[PDB]
């Protein structure tokens, strides 16, 4: 309690907040998805609503501390507003992302920050053939809105999406779910742009 109050004061009130990664000091943001349910499928507007967990993970030198100095505290929990968070957003989103969980991140002594917010995302997806046996395949690209490849480097611990937490009595069943890291190049800009393409193949139950 007392040691934890001193730790948060020496990390946020003492040192100024992280201004973001630069080309000289890049940051590696490892992200993984945990698909919960395909709630709505709109064939009239070509919109699909997803319920998932966006496991965001990054390591900062500014959020590093010795546990021995702060009463053997290895890790702590703090609000997402108190710390810097990556701007990883869906490029093909149709409606603003609805946060279903409290925005709280876990910070460890080595500076590794883990933030897993539960989100409801309505994105661009044509569901023509969802009632079919082969189903319909729909992709949605996730990545940094302003930072490029030289600033934020996206990573995936596994190519497979976590479907263990998926709703058993869902209206739509998953046939395939993959999170592939893609390195894109744009004519405008010489810098590369990394994006995690969430490809989901689903059909009606």
């Amino acid at each position: 309690q007392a040691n934890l109050m001193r730790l948060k004061s020496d990390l946020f009130n003492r040192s100024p907040m992280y201004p973001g990664p630069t080309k000289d000091d890049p940051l590696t943001v490892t992200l993984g998805f945990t698909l919960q349910d395909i709630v709505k499928v709109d064939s009239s507007t070509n919109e699909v609503d997803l319920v998932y967990y966006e496991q965001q993970r990054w390591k900062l030198n500014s959020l590093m501390w010795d546990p021995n100095e702060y009463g053997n505290i290895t890790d702590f929990r703090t609000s997402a507003a108190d710390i810097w968070t990556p701007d990883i957003t869906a490029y093909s989103s149709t409606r603003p992302v609805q946060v279903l969980s409290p925005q709280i991140a876990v910070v460890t002594h080595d500076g590794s920050v883990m933030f897993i917010p539960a989100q409801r995302l309505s994105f661009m997806c044509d569901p023509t053939g969802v009632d079919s046996e082969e189903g319909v395949t729909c992709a949605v690209k996730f990545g940094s809105w302003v930072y490029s490849g030289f600033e934020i480097d996206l990573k995936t611990d596994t190519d497979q999406v976590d479907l263990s937490s998926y709703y058993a009595s869902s209206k739509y069943e998953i046939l395939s779910a993959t999170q592939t890291r893609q390195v894109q190049h744009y004519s405008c800009c010489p810098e590369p742009y990394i994006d995690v393409n969430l490809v989901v193949k689903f059909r009606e139950r």
Copy 2:
């Protein structure tokens, strides 16, 4: 009036806010449900809307005071933003929780805090067989999003859900309603994961 103004000033303006429970200093959060109505049942998207009271109860040493010192004041009411609140959220939620009551908590001299917000929750539930006599059973797990068993220990005063405040002229009648405390242990991590499973068996009137 005058003694109450001094009490709130000596508790919030003097001492810094609670940073959250740690492994060394755990917290026991006792929660109970009071089901009011099953407003909406969506068979098209497998979503069910519930109106209930989430009776959150926890004891803090920081919010302790002697009533004799503060003009025999045994308890007081303060905004939920002024004090620390547990991150108890539904794991199978589809849409953000709608708060129907003012977020105000009751703090007693022994440090016990009681916060009962009225909420509207839309969660994952297959209502196939709601028109049947046996009805349909739907569960929703409630627990801390970031804190584990070593930090927040969930508790239930009773295994039965309060149905005395349930709407008599509701579209759906309750056959069974139970709030069971579940302790999950995984091969990954040695920490326990406590969640209150709200199981409700209901049918059409």
Copy 3:
């Protein structure tokens, strides 16, 4: 202008805000309703949407002043956020209350505060028989969420609801509208729980 600026400064900037009524210093909150329209009636979910004026009235010793001292000012208007307001909310509400008017209260020299916000409330009501000649009767209890009878004492100036401001070309006509003060007791505790029961009998036009 100049005398009014000094009055508001000597009342809010000088003295700290009202912490709420205690058992030793109780408060009498007189409330009355002015029904405007029954906008929506949902037979599918048993929800009824009401448009009304909640005339909240209470007297505080802290908001008392001599008009002769402040340039013969008898009363003034201030934002509902600047002053303390009672937590009077509908116990059978289904969706959060939508405020249709600016939240501004009128404070008189004797300390009497009048706050009349226009609200849209969607509450639990079975409308089976609204198309009938006798119509359907639906009640909704209004009261303090955290304070009991020893802290907040509810009062009604009249048992009849103001229907003079009711919409003439409404889809539903009012047959009866009453605001009854009800006292609820529990064996445990000696504190009474006062609530204003808004009973409305209506039918289709």
Copy 4:
């Protein structure tokens, strides 16, 4: 840039904010409407949605300055939260007013403030006969919620509503649109109550 920063600092940071008009110091608020479109017409709930511009105009002695003293600056733009705004709201509104434009006001050297927010208003209107050639007439009264005639005096520069900005390919065409200043007198209270009655006669295209 530099002269404008000094001007805003000498007007808001120096002098305290306007507490509102009193009986001794009344304020004249001139308002005009610019109807854009009749988006929705609900015959089931007797609700009509309007898209319009509410041109609010008032003169304050506190917001007066000499342009010669502040580098020949005749007028400036500031947020609606930084200055005092009148509580002009629709008395027959069914849903909260949706603001479609940024809430920014234009303040001139003579103290005249102009605030024109684009709004979407859902109000009480029976549309029985909208498909007819003569159409349907629907009125909505606009006025101060707390201030009476002795505090806020409403004014209209013209009795005709601006229909030059009205959508040509709208589902409903305007036959007549008038903004009439009405003074209401009650035997109860000697104070008058001024309201701008927006009368619109429309039919299907």
Copy 5:
């Protein structure tokens, strides 16, 4: 990291925020659109929902710095709340604009600021003839709500709208998309009013 923290501190914490452009010091705001999808088309209310990128670009002398002085930093990213942003809004909007991306702007050493927020806009558009081969043409004017031509001068780098990022499996295909700069003078006011007219010709797939 260290040089970037000093740069943001010397730009925002040192100098006060931009008060907005004046007649003496005008600002040129270059804006371009990147149409993603025509999600909804409502023939009942004459409303059309668009998903697009509003590329806002302006140069400020206050946000200028020498990269050699701040460790060869050419550009940085900061929140849209930390800096001044133009009040560019759609004049024919029916519902408030939904922001789908994080509001973060890119600031370069020469003072050029680029802010590209992804937005969902529901505006006035008659879709009679969308099922036809020639399709339906719908325009929406974009511009500063309070600042005139003498304060904010709108510009377009190209007359053609970026359709490279448009959804291939959309319900509606684009036949033509143009962003035309229009300078209109009104009888009311002596100042010119510049607006970017987004004209889109589309049909069903």
